[PDB]
Design an enzyme around this catalytic site. Sequence first.
Site, PDB file in Angstrom:
ATOM      1  N   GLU A 370       0.859  -1.167   0.000  1.00  0.00           N
ATOM      2  CA  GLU A 370       0.000   0.000   0.000  1.00  0.00           C
ATOM      3  C   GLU A 370       0.912   1.238   0.000  1.00  0.00           C
ATOM      4  O   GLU A 370       0.643   2.227  -0.718  1.00  0.00           O
ATOM      5  CB  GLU A 370      -0.875   0.023   1.232  1.00  0.00           C
ATOM      6  CG  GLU A 370      -1.864   1.225   1.265  1.00  0.00           C
ATOM      7  CD  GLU A 370      -1.301   2.541   1.773  1.00  0.00           C
ATOM      8  OE1 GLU A 370      -0.166   2.587   2.282  1.00  0.00           O
ATOM      9  OE2 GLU A 370      -2.054   3.558   1.671  1.00  0.00           O
ATOM     10  N   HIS A 629     -15.500   7.754 -11.183  1.00  0.00           N
ATOM     11  CA  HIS A 629     -16.689   8.179 -10.389  1.00  0.00           C
ATOM     12  C   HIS A 629     -16.900   9.659 -10.780  1.00  0.00           C
ATOM     13  O   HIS A 629     -15.960  10.465 -10.736  1.00  0.00           O
ATOM     14  CB  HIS A 629     -16.394   8.154  -8.871  1.00  0.00           C
ATOM     15  CG  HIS A 629     -17.633   8.027  -8.007  1.00  0.00           C
ATOM     16  ND1 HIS A 629     -18.529   9.071  -7.834  1.00  0.00           N
ATOM     17  CD2 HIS A 629     -18.115   6.990  -7.277  1.00  0.00           C
ATOM     18  CE1 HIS A 629     -19.529   8.670  -7.056  1.00  0.00           C
ATOM     19  NE2 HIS A 629     -19.299   7.414  -6.693  1.00  0.00           N
TER      20      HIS A 629
HETATM   21  C1  LIG Z   1      -2.948  13.757   7.289  1.00  0.00           C
HETATM   22  C2  LIG Z   1      -3.738  12.531   6.743  1.00  0.00           C
HETATM   23  C3  LIG Z   1      -5.189  12.462   7.332  1.00  0.00           C
HETATM   24  C4  LIG Z   1      -3.809  12.641   5.206  1.00  0.00           C
HETATM   25  N1  LIG Z   1      -4.854  13.622   4.713  1.00  0.00           N
HETATM   26  C5  LIG Z   1      -4.589  14.896   4.266  1.00  0.00           C
HETATM   27  O1  LIG Z   1      -3.463  15.413   4.364  1.00  0.00           O
HETATM   28  C6  LIG Z   1      -5.706  15.661   3.805  1.00  0.00           C
HETATM   29  C7  LIG Z   1      -5.537  16.984   3.409  1.00  0.00           C
HETATM   30  C8  LIG Z   1      -6.650  17.768   3.028  1.00  0.00           C
HETATM   31  C9  LIG Z   1      -7.925  17.202   2.968  1.00  0.00           C
HETATM   32  F1  LIG Z   1      -9.149  18.048   2.539  1.00  0.00           F
HETATM   33  C10 LIG Z   1      -8.116  15.870   3.341  1.00  0.00           C
HETATM   34  C11 LIG Z   1      -7.005  15.114   3.752  1.00  0.00           C
HETATM   35  C12 LIG Z   1      -4.158  11.238   4.677  1.00  0.00           C
HETATM   36  O2  LIG Z   1      -5.260  11.061   4.124  1.00  0.00           O
HETATM   37  N2  LIG Z   1      -3.260  10.233   4.977  1.00  0.00           N
HETATM   38  C13 LIG Z   1      -3.449   8.848   4.478  1.00  0.00           C
HETATM   39  C14 LIG Z   1      -2.120   8.204   4.208  1.00  0.00           C
HETATM   40  O3  LIG Z   1      -2.084   6.815   4.576  1.00  0.00           O
HETATM   41  P1  LIG Z   1      -0.894   5.965   4.075  1.00  0.00           P
HETATM   42  O4  LIG Z   1       0.486   6.518   4.632  1.00  0.00           O
HETATM   43  O5  LIG Z   1      -1.213   4.596   4.569  1.00  0.00           O
HETATM   44  N3  LIG Z   1      -0.916   5.963   2.490  1.00  0.00           N
HETATM   45  C15 LIG Z   1       0.372   6.190   1.743  1.00  0.00           C
HETATM   46  C16 LIG Z   1       0.288   5.823   0.222  1.00  0.00           C
HETATM   47  C17 LIG Z   1      -0.767   6.714  -0.521  1.00  0.00           C
HETATM   48  C18 LIG Z   1      -0.722   6.563  -2.047  1.00  0.00           C
HETATM   49  O6  LIG Z   1       0.301   6.130  -2.647  1.00  0.00           O
HETATM   50  O7  LIG Z   1      -1.728   6.910  -2.676  1.00  0.00           O
HETATM   51  C19 LIG Z   1       0.905   7.634   1.847  1.00  0.00           C
HETATM   52  O8  LIG Z   1       0.137   8.629   2.004  1.00  0.00           O
HETATM   53  O9  LIG Z   1       2.178   7.724   1.676  1.00  0.00           O
HETATM   54  C20 LIG Z   1      -4.225   8.127   5.513  1.00  0.00           C
HETATM   55  O10 LIG Z   1      -3.957   8.358   6.711  1.00  0.00           O
HETATM   56  O11 LIG Z   1      -5.214   7.603   5.079  1.00  0.00           O
HETATM   57 ZN   LIG Z   2      -1.329   3.196   5.861  1.00  0.00          ZN
HETATM   58 ZN   LIG Z   3       1.663   5.281   5.432  1.00  0.00          ZN
END
Ligand SMILES: CC(C)[C@H](NC(=O)c1ccc(F)cc1)C(=O)N[C@@H](COP(=O)(O)N[C@@H](CCC(=O)O)C(=O)O)C(=O)O
Ligand SMILES: [Zn+2]
Ligand SMILES: [Zn+2]
Lengths: 690, 690
Positions: A370, A629
Amino acid sequence: KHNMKAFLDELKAENIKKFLYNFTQIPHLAGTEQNFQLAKQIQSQWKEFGLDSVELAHYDVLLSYPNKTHPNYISIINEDGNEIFNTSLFEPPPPGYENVSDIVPPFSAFSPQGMPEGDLVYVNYARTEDFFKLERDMKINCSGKIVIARYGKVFRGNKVKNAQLAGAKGVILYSDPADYFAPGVKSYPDGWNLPGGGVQRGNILNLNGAGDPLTPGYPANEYAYRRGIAEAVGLPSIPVHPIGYYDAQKLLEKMGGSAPPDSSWRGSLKVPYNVGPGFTGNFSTQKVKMHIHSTNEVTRIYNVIGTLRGAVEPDRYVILGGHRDSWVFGGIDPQSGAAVVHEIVRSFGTLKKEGWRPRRTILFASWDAEEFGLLGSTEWAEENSRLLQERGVAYINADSSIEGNYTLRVDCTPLMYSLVHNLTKELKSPDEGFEGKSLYESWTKKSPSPEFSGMPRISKLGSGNDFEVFFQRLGIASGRARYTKNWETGYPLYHSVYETYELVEKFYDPMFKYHLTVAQVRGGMVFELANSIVLPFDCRDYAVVLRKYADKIYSISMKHPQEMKTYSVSFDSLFSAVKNFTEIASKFSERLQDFSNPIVLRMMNDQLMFLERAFIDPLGLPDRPFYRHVIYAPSSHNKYAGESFPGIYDALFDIESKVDPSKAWGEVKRQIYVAAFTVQAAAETLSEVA
Amino acid sequence: KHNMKAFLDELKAENIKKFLYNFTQIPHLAGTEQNFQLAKQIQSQWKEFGLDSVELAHYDVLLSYPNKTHPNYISIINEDGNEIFNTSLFEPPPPGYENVSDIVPPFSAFSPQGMPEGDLVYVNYARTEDFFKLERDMKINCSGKIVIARYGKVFRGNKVKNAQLAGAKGVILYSDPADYFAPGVKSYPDGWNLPGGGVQRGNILNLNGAGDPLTPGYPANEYAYRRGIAEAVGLPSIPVHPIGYYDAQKLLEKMGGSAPPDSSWRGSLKVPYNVGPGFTGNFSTQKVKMHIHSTNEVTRIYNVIGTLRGAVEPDRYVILGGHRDSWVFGGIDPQSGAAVVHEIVRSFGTLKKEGWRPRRTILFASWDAEEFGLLGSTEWAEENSRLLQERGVAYINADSSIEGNYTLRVDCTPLMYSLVHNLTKELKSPDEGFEGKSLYESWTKKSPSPEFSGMPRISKLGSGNDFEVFFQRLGIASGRARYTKNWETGYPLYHSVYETYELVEKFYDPMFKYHLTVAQVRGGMVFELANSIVLPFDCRDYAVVLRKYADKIYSISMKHPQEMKTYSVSFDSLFSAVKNFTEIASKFSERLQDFSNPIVLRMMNDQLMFLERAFIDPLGLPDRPFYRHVIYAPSSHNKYAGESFPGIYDALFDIESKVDPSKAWGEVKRQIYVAAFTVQAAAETLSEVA
Ligand SMILES: CC(C)[C@H](NC(=O)c1ccc(F)cc1)C(=O)N[C@@H](COP(=O)(O)N[C@@H](CCC(=O)O)C(=O)O)C(=O)O
Ligand SMILES: [Zn+2]
Ligand SMILES: [Zn+2]
Ligand SMILES: *[C@@H]1O[C@H](CO)[C@@H](O[C@@H]2O[C@H](CO)[C@@H](O[C@@H]3O[C@H](CO)[C@@H](O)[C@H](O[C@H]4O[C@H](CO)[C@@H](O)[C@H](O)[C@@H]4O)[C@@H]3O)[C@H](O)[C@H]2NC(C)=O)[C@H](O)[C@H]1NC(C)=O
Ligand SMILES: *[C@@H]1O[C@H](CO)[C@@H](O[C@@H]2O[C@H](CO)[C@@H](O[C@@H]3O[C@H](CO)[C@@H](O)[C@H](O[C@H]4O[C@H](CO)[C@@H](O)[C@H](O)[C@@H]4O)[C@@H]3O)[C@H](O)[C@H]2NC(C)=O)[C@H](O)[C@H]1NC(C)=O
Ligand SMILES: *[C@@H]1O[C@H](CO)[C@@H](O[C@@H]2O[C@H](CO)[C@@H](O[C@@H]3O[C@H](CO)[C@@H](O)[C@H](O)[C@@H]3O)[C@H](O)[C@H]2NC(C)=O)[C@H](O)[C@H]1NC(C)=O
Ligand SMILES: *[C@@H]1O[C@H](CO)[C@@H](O[C@@H]2O[C@H](CO)[C@@H](O[C@@H]3O[C@H](CO)[C@@H](O)[C@H](O)[C@@H]3O)[C@H](O)[C@H]2NC(C)=O)[C@H](O)[C@H]1NC(C)=O
Ligand SMILES: *[C@@H]1O[C@H](CO[C@@H]2O[C@@H](C)[C@@H](O)[C@@H](O)[C@@H]2O)[C@@H](O[C@@H]2O[C@H](CO)[C@@H](O)[C@H](O)[C@H]2NC(C)=O)[C@H](O)[C@H]1NC(C)=O
Ligand SMILES: *[C@@H]1O[C@H](CO[C@@H]2O[C@@H](C)[C@@H](O)[C@@H](O)[C@@H]2O)[C@@H](O[C@@H]2O[C@H](CO)[C@@H](O)[C@H](O)[C@H]2NC(C)=O)[C@H](O)[C@H]1NC(C)=O
Ligand SMILES: *[C@@H]1O[C@H](CO[C@@H]2O[C@@H](C)[C@@H](O)[C@@H](O)[C@@H]2O)[C@@H](O[C@@H]2O[C@H](CO)[C@@H](O)[C@H](O)[C@H]2NC(C)=O)[C@H](O)[C@H]1NC(C)=O
Ligand SMILES: *[C@@H]1O[C@H](CO[C@@H]2O[C@@H](C)[C@@H](O)[C@@H](O)[C@@H]2O)[C@@H](O[C@@H]2O[C@H](CO)[C@@H](O)[C@H](O)[C@H]2NC(C)=O)[C@H](O)[C@H]1NC(C)=O
Ligand SMILES: CC(C)[C@H](NC(=O)c1ccc(F)cc1)C(=O)N[C@@H](COP(=O)(O)N[C@@H](CCC(=O)O)C(=O)O)C(=O)O
Ligand SMILES: *[C@@H]1O[C@H](CO)[C@@H](O[C@@H]2O[C@H](CO)[C@@H](O)[C@H](O)[C@H]2NC(C)=O)[C@H](O)[C@H]1NC(C)=O
Ligand SMILES: *[C@@H]1O[C@H](CO)[C@@H](O[C@@H]2O[C@H](CO)[C@@H](O)[C@H](O)[C@H]2NC(C)=O)[C@H](O)[C@H]1NC(C)=O
Ligand SMILES: *[C@@H]1O[C@H](CO)[C@@H](O)[C@H](O)[C@H]1NC(C)=O
Ligand SMILES: *[C@@H]1O[C@H](CO)[C@@H](O)[C@H](O)[C@H]1NC(C)=O
Ligand SMILES: *[C@@H]1O[C@H](CO)[C@@H](O)[C@H](O)[C@H]1NC(C)=O
Ligand SMILES: *[C@@H]1O[C@H](CO)[C@@H](O)[C@H](O)[C@H]1NC(C)=O
Ligand SMILES: [Ca+2]
Ligand SMILES: [Ca+2]
Ligand SMILES: [Cl-]
Ligand SMILES: [Cl-]
Ligand SMILES: [Zn+2]
Ligand SMILES: [Zn+2]
């Protein structure tokens, strides 16, 4: 009795704790032997737990690793070519882990190799608007410069894309204490803050939903034909490397050229945050030099796929999935979610051993790779896309169960809003001061909806996690739930060697009660999706949000009244479709409550299941064929964020800067037509079928 | 009893005759008032006949018409610019029709306007291989020439595309007596041959499944956003016009330059069939000049859509559709099929009035603008694509019921082979010498299968008719059946003013017994598809043909043994998938006969219904996004013909002429991978579901 309460009561905080500890003693980096061993262990235990079948599904995908004998680093180099300062080769390991092998050093996965040398420009968060400000307002040219950007606000892949389109020849990412150090909390191991030597790992791809860069559209199986690297999807063209704030300070402190344009460009370090280019007078002949030697390599990955066969509709799938691979120990990301899944499987298995079966089939997934671009979930969905799109009821994600200890956070399709409201009203709040109160009550109090009194905030699905292929490509109703922080007063140690079992047990969730509450929300959603006679989707909730998004996109267009007159840009068709959707949804709901007949029921459950499916356009969004979508897509500026009516949004974005307004406004109108048609088509799937 | 026999017995030859007469007294050209009036009449009668609902579905699509006050024609022009010979402005009308208004004169629909002037080159049938021979073997350059081609062998749109890619500046199509005059039969009105003044109308688009050239992907509804003409799909870039053989003789008789390369290039006219370029010595300064003034115009079209709601599975659709628009009177094409549909509706309605309902919903369709590129069926399917792909069981086409009086002709998916065999064994043969024998027996005798003793030939579906969107885009099992001629000893008056009611009644089918037999085959198929408890599809028949097509494509590749060694081109994965498909299909068939349980049944009927669906690739075939079926596509050289494993076929086609063999062979391998994967994925939809 074998009911949801039995399922929920069997879940134990203490089990989740034991599993988290078990999953976080060594690193489990995708493509490594340790992560294969963990896959085999999970497979063995899920069988022990009582699932009908548990298989590994493996793929050979493009991954990226540093070179063990040729380390990545950044220098300040003087005019003689002496490297007078070098960034760190590794994060100082935390207490008791100083002898753990195979900690991958900090790197940006999928960076190309190179040793570019040049003058720095500081680009704040490297967002679209940060580059606008530099280029349009400040007249600073990034062409041939090394850009230094702070992590935060948007997915790091978007930062890299934006730097690349600005002409940068390299990117340096760093963690500013403004974004990764909460005032009054200590650095790991004494608190949950990022130390100056901590560094965030992470891939910097721009895949737009493709999965393995070499095999877009098709699973990376044994006979797969692979693109050559030059045609791979989403690889950056310039070298990129991440550093901590001790090292960042050394690179920023000498910066000259223009002042930051305002205070939103200043972090918390004792430096001026000059944009550059280059260093002040006395150091003007020094340059920055990157040394990147990471290699992309096709590597085997392993998903674990568990099946609990449904008693009545075995050909209807409710999927609970989350990843297993981690950058290092994965104390929060992902093992706090994987331990929750493990306990959920255990509980369902207890019921199964007493003779119970869910009505529909439940699939459990432990995804691999992932962290390298959603590769495991996406390859498996490419493989099984025909089964998923005719049989997939819902997908519930299960990554990190916590990023805070304040309140619930839910992102899902509107089809699950009512399900989530109802479930959380039946769960106990784990929060201090809400003992004996429902989770709905504490969540609603701490995170009120911005539009509805007495209701909680629920966010739209963005991307950057394993639901992406199920929701944005295939149109399967998806949801996620975790515990989060209070954004008014994500987590600092994200993707660092410091994200450990001890981090969680000491500072986040010592009693594992937030983990338990998340297990009850995720598990309870799955239970209801898999067991309710009528699917627990309320199409009327989609009607309400569609109107809100229609209002929103119309308002954005209405900033350009003259152009809307000149080009006859009307949103009438979109509002008409949304009105029709509202009326048809209302009538369908009446029938759903007004029909002993299993064909009518299954007919109606098929209408419910295929409703999210109806929002898929098989031609995809412009230049993003795997985002299909039409209501939601990951933001083109930030893959983490969801954007509503993304086709119209992107057509309007920065439209005043387009050199051919007639063409640009024509494309706005085309996207309005696609959106109105898709809403009307979705509505008609809810009409009487004949 | 209300059973298939009751349905079949109610069908009357005399009714079909009455309806054919009714539908063929005036022209019913798409987009005209007369064709709208006929739509309203059909709608009224289908309601009278007893259908639950009958609606018009209208679209505004691009059509093409000559200019009434600026007629199209071709000249031979001398060096002074005098037009010394002019082709006809109209076909001499047949007896008793000399006063009928609104007969559209012969033209090639969607030709651009122009008056090109130049030297002729004769290009035989204008097939890919004819141009190969001219260019590669004969060294004749068509660039800047007017090409003259005889109709026949391939869809006229492909001829035009091939002439355009050869650099032609205009195309003249004509009907050679070799292809449109059977020896020993008289010209209309005294026989069924084409007179020298007869001319075949027809569109010359290359739509590749797009539908309305202006709205690919989306229905051409009231708010549709249209491409500008310069971006429209499939329009030819050079003017084109069709003529009869009296006029052709005048254009060919003076031709000089090279002799025809062999006798396969010579038709039946008393001319040398010199390829040119240009005319012999004495006439060397004369040229050919075309005058084309037709206009493309967005015009409203109307489908009639009739619904007979199913009693048990109203959300499962069996569709009987065929077109209503005609070039002129449509005595065979399409009204001999539309009269059959009308009688089928009448019969089903009789049963309905006595209290019967089919198990599944039956949809009846009268398509408009089929002759202008399948526009009516395709726009309606674009509109309803979500309902069709989740609910569409089968589509049975119903164009021209006859092109001869010799034997049955069936083209369908392998999923319908067993259905067709079984049904025709229960029908009476209408053939002389087979009285008291089954249709299966006469058909098998007259048209034996080339591979199986005691079985009849059934052909693969190509295109050039209204099933195209349902089968090749959407993956719904499709079939057609009509009466045909003996190809060892299609019809001459095709698309001419001479194709009348009298043609049919006098020369094809005076007793309307072949029409009746076709009504029983089409109606009986629909009855069984809509009423059989278990869908009447045998997945094992797909297994057999897949192996045959795999053998075939492998053999084509094996003409290049050295390249297969050099580039490691293996068909092993494809054969493995086909073997797996065979084993899984066999096991599924066992379960299908071995399971009182309606969920298991409907589960199994869904597996049957989604099996054709599984062969769809949502990325489409290369550069043809609306041909998505991986087993079948219309031939890239001839839209009328089906091609099996089309992605691999086109990658291999003329591969020895590609300048980069490595790249060309890599694309062969990529298509082998896509095909093997798709077969395996299709097979897995037949596995146990959990
Ligand atoms: C800070 C965190 C909640 C971040 N979201 C945002 O920074 C964000 C910014 C503005 C917004 F309107 C919504 C979300 C986010 O969605 N992180 C994700 C990242 O999870 P992961 O580290 O498992 N995913 C990896 C792989 C993602 C990929 O390759 O697509 C990464 O981001 O490096 C999560 O926690 O689901
Ligand atoms: Zn993760
Ligand atoms: Zn991660
Ligand atoms: C929401 O649902 C409603 C159904 O309640 C649906 O209404 C439909 O709207 C269409 C498009 O506006 C109507 O189309 C008209 O149909 C008649 C024939 O029935 C035509 O004569 C009309 O064309 C004439 O007028 C046009 C406009 O002035 C001209 O452009 C044209 O040249 C003709 O002169 C027109 O096509 C349709 O009748 C209704 N259907 C109903 C009321 O049942 C609406 O379309 C839905 N919204 C969306 C976005 O789909
Ligand atoms: C038709 O159906 C059969 C099932 O009966 C299906 O068989 C599968 O074939 C695949 C691909 O050949 C097998 O994959 C192997 O799986 C094992 C683990 O179980 C791996 O160790 C293997 O990889 C090693 O060997 C490879 C080949 O030498 C090397 O390239 C690789 O680097 C490793 O060393 C390999 O991936 C799979 O086990 C079977 N499954 C069974 C028998 O259940 C077949 O694929 C189907 N046909 C199609 C076209 O799908
Ligand atoms: C979340 O919970 C709410 C509240 O329980 C659910 O709404 C309720 O659902 C029931 C069952 O359909 C409705 O009962 C029905 O009442 C009507 C009379 O108006 C009657 O015709 C039916 O026979 C049936 O008894 C009830 O009205 C409805 N209550 C509301 C809307 O306030 C809702 O379905 C749940 N959401 C889910 C499960 O996704
Ligand atoms: C076309 O007609 C043929 C011949 O009637 C159909 O095949 C036959 O179908 C029946 C019904 O499934 C089979 O009967 C079964 O026999 C087995 C014993 O082997 C038993 O287990 C079942 O309970 C049932 O009685 C029959 O064997 C089979 N005959 C064959 C293959 O020769 C065929 O289904 C028809 N095709 C259609 C309807 O598409
Ligand atoms: C990873 O790098 C190794 C080692 O790189 C060497 O040591 C570094 C500190 C630096 O000085 C490099 O320039 C050195 O080459 C690579 O191994 C070398 O490869 C070359 C041929 O390509 C060989 O002649 C050298 O002797 C090798 N050096 C050693 C110490 O073994 C290796 O190729 C890289 N691994 C990859 C790219 O996957
Ligand atoms: C910064 O590092 C460079 C390079 O050091 C090498 O690579 C590192 C990743 C690490 O593994 C070191 O141990 C390696 O020696 C230093 O410059 C080198 O210094 C050596 C010894 O003086 C010399 O022989 C090399 O030519 C130098 N290489 C280069 C590319 O300049 C440098 O001294 C370090 N700077 C500081 C301030 O520590
Ligand atoms: C269809 O053609 C008419 C008529 O064409 C005229 O008569 C022909 C025999 C030939 O001599 C043409 O060149 C003539 O123009 C078109 O009507 C003419 O249009 C022009 C302006 O475009 C006008 O000034 C003329 O007076 C018109 N002539 C007549 C007789 O009305 C008409 O535009 C065409 N219809 C289309 C393109 O849809
Ligand atoms: C071939 O036809 C041309 C053009 O005739 C006109 O257009 C036709 C479609 C038809 O409608 C005719 O009635 C029209 O007159 C003839 O050449 C024209 O002749 C007239 C009268 O002699 C003269 O004024 C024009 O300038 C000519 N026009 C052109 C374009 O050359 C020609 O005579 C016909 N040839 C034969 C052999 O019949
Ligand atoms: C001679 C005829 C049987 C022809 N087929 C072929 O020429 C043919 C050639 C080689 C082969 F392997 C198979 C078929 C054919 O398929 N004709 C079609 C044409 O019907 P229509 O006139 O209604 N269709 C129109 C519109 C087609 C379109 O736009 O796609 C037309 O062809 O102009 C039909 O009869 O279904
Ligand atoms: C995590 O838990 C697993 C499962 O209990 C442990 O793996 C087991 O180890 C024991 C003792 O070595 C073996 O006898 C079993 O065969 C293993 N069971 C499996 C793999 O299913 C594992 O050692 C634990 N890991 C840590 C770090 O505590
Ligand atoms: C074809 O048949 C139809 C239907 O019988 C005829 O249309 C009818 O004409 C009568 C007499 O003029 C009217 O009273 C009816 O209202 C019509 N019925 C309809 C339209 O449903 C039509 O005249 C016949 N056409 C020809 C050429 O014979
Ligand atoms: C930025 O720099 C390079 C000069 O190396 C130039 O080619 C490029 O066009 C410049 N862009 C702007 C906007 O000044
Ligand atoms: C846990 O909750 C307390 C009390 O609100 C808070 O002060 C602390 O910062 C929280 N821990 C984390 C890791 O957020
Ligand atoms: C055909 O003719 C034109 C000359 O007008 C030339 O440009 C073109 O390349 C020629 N092609 C061949 C194959 O000779
Ligand atoms: C009808 O059948 C007869 C007898 O075989 C045959 O000679 C005649 O040509 C047929 N008519 C047509 C139009 O094919
Ligand atoms: Ca892939
Ligand atoms: Ca269209
Ligand atoms: Cl999650
Ligand atoms: Cl047909
Ligand atoms: Zn036709
Ligand atoms: Zn036709």
